[PDB]
Amino acid sequence: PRAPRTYSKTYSTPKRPYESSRLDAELKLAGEFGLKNKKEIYRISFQLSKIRRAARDLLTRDEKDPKRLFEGNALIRRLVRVGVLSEDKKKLDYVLALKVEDFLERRLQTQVYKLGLAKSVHHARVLITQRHIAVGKQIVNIPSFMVRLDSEKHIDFAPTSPFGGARPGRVARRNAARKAEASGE
Amino acid sequence: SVGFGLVYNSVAEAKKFEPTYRLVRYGLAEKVEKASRQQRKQKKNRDKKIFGTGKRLAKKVARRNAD
Amino acid sequence: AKVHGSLARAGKVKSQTPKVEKTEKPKKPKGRAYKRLLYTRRFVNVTLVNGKRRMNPGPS
Amino acid sequence: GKGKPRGLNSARKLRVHRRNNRWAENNYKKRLLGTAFKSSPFGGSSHAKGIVLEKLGIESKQPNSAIRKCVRVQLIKNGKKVTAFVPNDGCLNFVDENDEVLLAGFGRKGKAKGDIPGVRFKVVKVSGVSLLALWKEKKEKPRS
RNA sequence: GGAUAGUGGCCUACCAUGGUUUCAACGGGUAACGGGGAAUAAGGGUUCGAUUCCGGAGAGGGAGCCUGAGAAACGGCUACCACAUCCAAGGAAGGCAGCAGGCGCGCAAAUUACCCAAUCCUAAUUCAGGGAGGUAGUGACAAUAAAUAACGAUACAGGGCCCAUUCGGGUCUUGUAAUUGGAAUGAGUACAAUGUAAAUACCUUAACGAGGAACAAUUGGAGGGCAAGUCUGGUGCCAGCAGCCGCGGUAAUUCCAGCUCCAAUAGCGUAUAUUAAAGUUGUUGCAGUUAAAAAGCUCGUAGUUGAACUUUGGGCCCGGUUGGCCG
RNA sequence: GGACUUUUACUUUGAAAAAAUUAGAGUGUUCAAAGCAGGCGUAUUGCUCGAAUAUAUUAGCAUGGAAUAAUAGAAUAGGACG
RNA sequence: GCCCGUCGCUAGUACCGAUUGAAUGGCUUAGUGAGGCCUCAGGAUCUGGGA
Ligand SMILES: [Mg+2]
Ligand SMILES: [Mg+2]
Ligand SMILES: [Mg+2]
Ligand SMILES: [Mg+2]
Ligand SMILES: [Mg+2]
Ligand SMILES: [Mg+2]
Ligand SMILES: [Mg+2]
Ligand SMILES: [Mg+2]
Ligand SMILES: [Mg+2]
Ligand SMILES: [Mg+2]
Ligand SMILES: [Mg+2]
Ligand SMILES: [Mg+2]
Ligand SMILES: [Mg+2]
Ligand SMILES: [Mg+2]
Ligand SMILES: [Mg+2]
Ligand SMILES: [Mg+2]
Ligand SMILES: [Mg+2]
Ligand SMILES: [Mg+2]
Ligand SMILES: [Mg+2]
Ligand SMILES: [Mg+2]
Ligand SMILES: [Mg+2]
Ligand SMILES: [Mg+2]
Ligand SMILES: [Mg+2]
Ligand SMILES: [Mg+2]
Ligand SMILES: [Mg+2]
Ligand SMILES: [Mg+2]
Ligand SMILES: [Mg+2]
Ligand SMILES: [Mg+2]
Ligand SMILES: [Mg+2]
Ligand SMILES: [Mg+2]
Ligand SMILES: [Mg+2]
Ligand SMILES: [Mg+2]
Ligand SMILES: [Mg+2]
Ligand SMILES: [Mg+2]
Ligand SMILES: [Mg+2]
Ligand SMILES: [Mg+2]
Ligand SMILES: [Mg+2]
Ligand SMILES: [Mg+2]
């Protein structure tokens, strides 16, 4: 006797299992944004998919219909918010266009690399999952953080770890305990 | 770290209005620990088998030890 | 048709292929790093284009 | 317009005809006749566990020549006797009679496999332990 | 009239001959509790719903009833039927479809643990009780996030590019490398505080904690469908594979392995069921000369269906909501 | 308040309408599945936005419409108005 | 070349079938009929017609 704790799934598999061309095109995405799963691509293309459905569905009602204006604006502004949608094409026939890489371009993974600070999509991963870098003073260790435009300015290493100062940390602090122990006393 | 706090108008009104495990955590209340929650139930259940006081049923069994 | 055929030979060819043990090799990176290895194998530096392109050739 | 009444009130007829003709559908008919539950060696269920009566040597169908190694199993919930195939080289050495195997379908919806005539099932586990394991050597057959 | 809390064939007397049905009554089946809902995504549909909420029904099977505002109550009683325990053989006692736990059944499902701290319920009641309920254990049911690595130097090799009368390497890096280089981090271990009813975990965080011998990713597949070899060894229509087509009888692209290679990846195969594909159930939307399919023929009830025609045209006023050109 | 009214189908808007589910708004649970939170300062004595919306059909209700399709009317005048 | 049926082998499935065959479950005639409830009586005892 409780409230059903609700869930739902966040990805979708391709209809055809072995399409050599979709396969190449898929890996290349991972190679480019440092993913580990086709799922990480499956995930997004699914997000993308429904967004389009929302957008299609809205586009069949008449221009300046109440739901359309409310739900339309809401969709667009949220997309802009994370910097997927262009300021100009801010009217949802380009949310209808859109595509996967427009989404990929906003993962913390990708931002933490884009303005240097990593110099490799993979080094970008490792840094993020290893508690370095943050948004505010709030540390973020999830590569798919979807950097929300007005947070892009505040992506630095965190006040902890090295890099953002305040200790080298044990593996160096080990070697520094091997210099004044061997050579000194 | 975000948490919650209260502050009472006196210790008398704290000691009456607070949870009784909280007055424990601090020191202004003894944990008076008891028989296991299920040991206790069995106390109540064993007691149900007896009508009245009890000790009067000791002496009638103090005759049993003859026959 | 026939159902009470010989059984003597059950297990024949597995039990008579000479053993050869696996060879010890560099461990392959797991996760992301493998997808990376594939990307650079498949698409970055490429390899050959004899006629078109191959993936598990031996002696060609 | 051929056939189907196009009237606006002809719903009933149009419904009924469908009910009628669903019966010409193999699966629908099976579903409602409860063919699963009624005939069919398994309950209608996915697997069934039974006991080994005799090890058989079924000669394959042409154009293949072979001896196919099977087991007569007497299902436990049923007494129904069934002949099941024993996948992969050897493996028939893992069974023995009176042993307790666990049978499953052949993924052909009823209907026997390839060149094995009559066998509609395969062994999956003996003595509670899985053929596959025993084959690879990830596991050893129990005491008795 | 009686009975009921009360209407009523509810029951009884008297009287009558009615009630339902191809617009499917009545009977049979249901591996049937109904609903909110669930799964599948062009749409129309198809299939499912024991099961977190609502309703109903039950407490081994039937019936009976006491108490009471409320039960035809079962953690109430009475009887019979079926089970079944204790005994000094005279008798007495029992009802887990509550919580756990055992047997059985089977393809199939967890602890004989803690607490009333929360949620709330009950009583004479702030206090007691609450296997309601919360806490933990067992737990790859499902669902979410996503570690197994990251970066320089060097050894040639390039591909660049300026020059090329010709050595070439030198800058900008593409990277294959059997010596190298210091960095980073939690998996874990663990002072401590936090957490909690008390604990465990999580979040924090001192001390520890990564170089291949790990802290070492799997699960299927590599003839076609279908992404990946015509490598090497083995067998020789045997052993086996093969959803389907097909492979195997001595150079096996298919079996048994080695190497290498693919696909998905903390998950991947398999069996069964269902859904999409299926316009192969066809209202949308099927097919019937010869592929499956027009009753030998006409009549004909139900059923579906069913020609055209009856206030149209013109005139006047009122005030709205978008949009233009100005603001 | 009296006195009377041919029957229907269709369609429009609307009431009455559980929650979770679903669709969907707002909110950076570090992300996310979720959750219904939360956000601001004088962070020494409080300030404040929320907790929408939609779907919810077959039947019953309530209202607008009068095309399409039915029904009924006056022929032995037992017609209609006074 | 194709190809039809009897006849013969192995294996599997369903049918028919003496046994007025068997088993389970649901109703149900007739007979017997527990028990509580209602009711006519009863009156161990125990009071002021009642218990
Ligand atoms: Mg107690
Ligand atoms: Mg008491
Ligand atoms: Mg037929
Ligand atoms: Mg046999
Ligand atoms: Mg049984
Ligand atoms: Mg009457
Ligand atoms: Mg009659
Ligand atoms: Mg019918
Ligand atoms: Mg049932
Ligand atoms: Mg239900
Ligand atoms: Mg149902
Ligand atoms: Mg059931
Ligand atoms: Mg009941
Ligand atoms: Mg029972
Ligand atoms: Mg009976
Ligand atoms: Mg009862
Ligand atoms: Mg009970
Ligand atoms: Mg009860
Ligand atoms: Mg005795
Ligand atoms: Mg129980
Ligand atoms: Mg299970
Ligand atoms: Mg209490
Ligand atoms: Mg008191
Ligand atoms: Mg409990
Ligand atoms: Mg590992
Ligand atoms: Mg290591
Ligand atoms: Mg291929
Ligand atoms: Mg060879
Ligand atoms: Mg070979
Ligand atoms: Mg091979
Ligand atoms: Mg899959
Ligand atoms: Mg239609
Ligand atoms: Mg067809
Ligand atoms: Mg024909
Ligand atoms: Mg004809
Ligand atoms: Mg007409
Ligand atoms: Mg409506
Ligand atoms: Mg709502």
Curated annotation (Swiss-Prot), chain A:
Pfam families the record matches: Ribosomal_S4, S4
SMART domains given in the database record: Ribosomal_S4, S4
BP GO annotations: maturation of SSU-rRNA from tricistronic rRNA transcript (SSU-rRNA, 5.8S rRNA, LSU-rRNA); ribosomal small subunit biogenesis; translation
Region (Disordered) residue spans: 159-185
Linked residues for Glycyl lysine isopeptide (Lys-Gly) (interchain with G-Cter in ubiquitin): 179
Cellular component, GO annotation: 90S preribosome; cytoplasm; cytosol; cytosolic small ribosomal subunit; nucleolus; nucleoplasm; small-subunit processome
The UniProt record lists the keyword Transport: no
UniProt KW keywords: Cytoplasm, Isopeptide bond, Nucleus, Phosphoprotein, Ribonucleoprotein, Ribosomal protein, Ribosome biogenesis, RNA-binding, rRNA processing, rRNA-binding, Ubl conjugation
PTM-bearing positions, type Phosphoserine: 183
Note: Present with 106000 molecules/cell in log phase SD medium.
Annotated localization: Cytoplasm; Nucleus, Nucleolus
Main location: cytoplasm
Gene3D superfamilies: RNA-binding S4 domain
Disulphide-bridged cysteine pairs: none
Classification of source organism: Eukaryota, Fungi, Dikarya, Ascomycota, Saccharomycotina
Functional note: Component of the ribosome, a large ribonucleoprotein complex responsible for the synthesis of proteins in the cell. The small ribosomal subunit (SSU) binds messenger RNAs (mRNAs) and translates the encoded message by selecting cognate aminoacyl-transfer RNA (tRNA) molecules. The large subunit (LSU) contains the ribosomal catalytic site termed the peptidyl transferase center (PTC), which catalyzes the formation of peptide bonds, thereby polymerizing the amino acids delivered by tRNAs into a polypeptide chain.
Domain S4 RNA-binding: 106-180
GO molecular function, one term: rRNA binding
Transmembrane regions listed in the UniProt entry: none
Domain of life: Eukaryota
Keyword Zinc-finger: no
Name this polypeptide is given: Small ribosomal subunit protein uS4A
From Swiss-Prot, chain B:
Subcellular location as annotated: Cytoplasm
Disulfide bridges in this chain: none
Top-level lineage group: Eukaryota
Biased segments, Basic residues type: 37-47, 56-67
Post-translational modification: N-terminally acetylated by acetyltransferase NatA. Also partially acetylated by NatC.
Region annotation Disordered: where it falls in the sequence: 34-67
Residues passing through the membrane, by range: none
Subunit (UniProt): Component of the small ribosomal subunit (SSU). Mature yeast ribosomes consist of a small (40S) and a large (60S) subunit. The 40S small subunit contains 1 molecule of ribosomal RNA (18S rRNA) and 33 different proteins (encoded by 57 genes). The large 60S subunit contains 3 rRNA molecules (25S, 5.8S and 5S rRNA) and 46 different proteins (encoded by 81 genes).
Note: There are 2 genes for eS24 in yeast.
Function of the protein: Component of the ribosome, a large ribonucleoprotein complex responsible for the synthesis of proteins in the cell. The small ribosomal subunit (SSU) binds messenger RNAs (mRNAs) and translates the encoded message by selecting cognate aminoacyl-transfer RNA (tRNA) molecules. The large subunit (LSU) contains the ribosomal catalytic site termed the peptidyl transferase center (PTC), which catalyzes the formation of peptide bonds, thereby polymerizing the amino acids delivered by tRNAs into a polypeptide chain.
Family to which the UniProt record says this protein belongs: Belongs to the eukaryotic ribosomal protein eS24 family.
Descriptive protein name: Small ribosomal subunit protein eS24A
Species this chain originates from: Saccharomyces cerevisiae (strain ATCC 204508 / S288c) (Baker's yeast)
Swiss-Prot record, chain C:
Molecular function GO labels: structural constituent of ribosome
InterPro entries: Ribosomal_eS30 (IPR006846)
Superkingdom of origin organism: Eukaryota
Sequence segments annotated as region (Disordered): 1-34
Modified residues annotated as Phosphoserine in this record: 15
One BP annotation, GO: cytoplasmic translation
Compartment(s) where it occurs, according to its Swiss-Prot or TrEMBL record: Cytoplasm
Keyword Transit peptide: no
Alphabetic keyword roster: Cytoplasm, Phosphoprotein, Ribonucleoprotein, Ribosomal protein
Modified residues (Phosphothreonine): 47
Listed Pfam families: Ribosomal_S30
GO cellular component terms given for this protein: cytoplasmic stress granule; cytosol; cytosolic small ribosomal subunit
Quaternary structure, from the entry: Component of the small ribosomal subunit (SSU). Mature yeast ribosomes consist of a small (40S) and a large (60S) subunit. The 40S small subunit contains 1 molecule of ribosomal RNA (18S rRNA) and 33 different proteins (encoded by 57 genes). The large 60S subunit contains 3 rRNA molecules (25S, 5.8S and 5S rRNA) and 46 different proteins (encoded by 81 genes).
Other comments on record: Present with 37600 molecules/cell in log phase SD medium.
Family per record: Belongs to the eukaryotic ribosomal protein eS30 family.
Entry function: Component of the ribosome, a large ribonucleoprotein complex responsible for the synthesis of proteins in the cell. The small ribosomal subunit (SSU) binds messenger RNAs (mRNAs) and translates the encoded message by selecting cognate aminoacyl-transfer RNA (tRNA) molecules. The large subunit (LSU) contains the ribosomal catalytic site termed the peptidyl transferase center (PTC), which catalyzes the formation of peptide bonds, thereby polymerizing the amino acids delivered by tRNAs into a polypeptide chain.
From Swiss-Prot, chain D:
Subcellular location field: Cytoplasm
Record keywords, A-Z: Cytoplasm, Hydroxylation, Isopeptide bond, Ribonucleoprotein, Ribosomal protein, Ubl conjugation
GO biological process: maintenance of translational fidelity; maturation of SSU-rRNA from tricistronic rRNA transcript (SSU-rRNA, 5.8S rRNA, LSU-rRNA); regulation of translational fidelity; translation
Record bears the keyword Ribonucleoprotein: yes
Superkingdom assignment: Eukaryota
Post-translational modification: Hydroxylation at Pro-63 affects translation termination efficiency. The stereochemistry of the 3,4-dihydroxyproline has not yet been determined.
Keyword 4Fe-4S appears in the UniProt entry: no
UniProt GO molecular function: structural constituent of ribosome
Modified residues (3,4-dihydroxyproline): 63
InterPro entries tied to this protein: NA-bd_OB-fold, Ribosomal_uS12, Ribosomal_uS12_euk/arc
Residue location of crosslink Glycyl lysine isopeptide (Lys-Gly) (interchain with G-Cter in ubiquitin): 55
Gene Ontology CC terms, in alphabetical order: cytosol; cytosolic small ribosomal subunit; ribosome
Function: Component of the ribosome, a large ribonucleoprotein complex responsible for the synthesis of proteins in the cell. The small ribosomal subunit (SSU) binds messenger RNAs (mRNAs) and translates the encoded message by selecting cognate aminoacyl-transfer RNA (tRNA) molecules. The large subunit (LSU) contains the ribosomal catalytic site termed the peptidyl transferase center (PTC), which catalyzes the formation of peptide bonds, thereby polymerizing the amino acids delivered by tRNAs into a polypeptide chain.
More info: Present with 10600 molecules/cell in log phase SD medium. There are 2 genes for uS12 in yeast.
Stored NCBIfam families: PRK04211.1 (NF003254), uS12_E_A (TIGR00982)
